[PDB]
Design a protein around this ligand. Structure first.
Ligand SMILES: CS[C@@]1(C(=O)Nc2ccc3[nH]nc(-c4ccc(F)cc4)c3c2)CCN(CC(=O)N2CCN(c3ccc(-c4ncccn4)cc3)CC2)C1
Length: 328
């Protein structure tokens, strides 16, 4: 059932979120049915609240929202967004990208991320399938379902703490001492996306939770004494000290045909210690992106921007947040 002004539906894809179609206003329309679970309501409210406050060329917008006229009759919510042609995940299954496509797509990811981070927001699930593309090579970041307001003072957690965001794009600190409440979480994922664009393969394809950290240390090598000193947890320190010494796999052996400036930026985004990891503004200013770098054309948000609310209260908040799209 797709009850939506919008006609001639055509299937694009599906996932845990629900189903996404194309339709004539040509737009994208996704049907969300989250009201039976608190977690689904939280993700829906984050997506809506955030995307409605953001206005940026490299961030997907929300054009319209369809739902019943009362809270009692609201069972689904339809979100209308700009139609794109594909995503980076699908493109990388069939095309090897030239360096100048990688450079421009990376520029756009970091331009959008500058804006998100300037609003004090973390995306927390950056990956190729969340980067939408068209034939004119415009790139738009999507899926803010796991987004949060940054909170570096409460980022600390114990060793091997469970995490929801996509495993292959998790920074090493997620497995050691971090809840993913700092902007450095997103820079790591962007580093993983760059590596993936360079070889059409995920750089750190962990098969399970701790294997993710095995893959990261397998390439970066053993962390320095200084980086071990920044690790707060007794258990995380003991674990890292227990491992055999491993030397760093050089970027030019993993990526023998990549541009040397792309590999220098990659090295800086994939820095083990999050305190030493390059920030979004510094990455935009890196020599690899010099042809595109223009701070005057990299806008920021006008002002900065659930866990213990029951699903019923979250449904009322979603109802209120979507009220602006009703007739009159
Ligand atoms: C990256 S997929 C996405 C999206 O925005 N897609 C999208 C949005 C706009 C688009 N324009 N053009 C294309 C497109 C893409 C590829 C292609 F080949 C052609 C066109 C396109 C695709 C669709 C969903 N959206 C996130 C998103 O909408 N939200 C809200 C929902 N949320 C959620 C809610 C419920 C559940 C659940 N429910 C039941 C059982 C289990 N789980 C889980 C999660 C998650 C956060 C992200």
């Amino acid at each position: 059932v797709f009850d939506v002004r919008y006609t001639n539906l055509s299937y694009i894809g599906e996932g845990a979120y629900g189903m996404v179609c194309s339709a004539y206003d040509r737009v994208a329309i996704k049907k969300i049915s989250p009201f039976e679970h608190q977690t689904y309501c939280q993700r829906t409210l984050r997506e809506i609240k955030i995307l409605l406050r953001f206005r940026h060329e490299n961030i997907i917008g929300i054009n319209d929202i369809i739902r019943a006229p009362t809270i009692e009759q609201m069972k689904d919510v339809y979100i209308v967004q700009d139609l794109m042609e594909t995503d980076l995940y699908k493109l990388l299954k069939t095309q090897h990208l030239s360096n100048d496509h990688i450079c421009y797509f990376l520029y756009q990811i970091l331009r959008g991320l500058k804006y998100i981070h300037s609003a004090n927001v973390l995306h927390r699930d950056l990956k190729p399938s969340n980067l939408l593309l068209n034939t004119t090579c415009d790139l738009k970041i999507c899926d803010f379902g796991l987004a949060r307001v940054a909170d570096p003072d409460h980022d600390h957690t114990g060793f091997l703490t469970e995490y929801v965001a996509t495993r292959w794009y998790r920074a090493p600190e997620i497995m050691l001492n971090s809840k993913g409440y700092t902007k450095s979480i997103d820079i790591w994922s962007v580093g993983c996306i760059l590596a993936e664009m360079l070889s059409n393969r995920p750089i750190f394809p962990g098969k399970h939770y701790l294997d993710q950290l095995n893959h990261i240390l397998g390439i970066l090598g053993s962390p320095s004494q200084e980086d071990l000193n920044c690790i707060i947890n007794l258990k995380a320190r003991n674990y890292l000290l227990s491992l055999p010494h491993k030397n760093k796999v050089p970027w030019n052996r993993l990526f023998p045909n990549a541009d040397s400036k792309a590999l220098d930026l990659l090295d800086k985004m994939l820095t083990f210690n999050p305190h030493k990891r390059i920030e979004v503004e510094q990455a935009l200013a890196h020599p690899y992106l010099e042809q595109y770098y223009d701070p005057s054309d990299e806008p920021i948000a006008e002002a900065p921007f659930l866990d213990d609310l029951p699903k019923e209260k979250l449904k009322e908040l979603i109802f209120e947040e979507t009220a602006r799209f009703q007739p009159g």
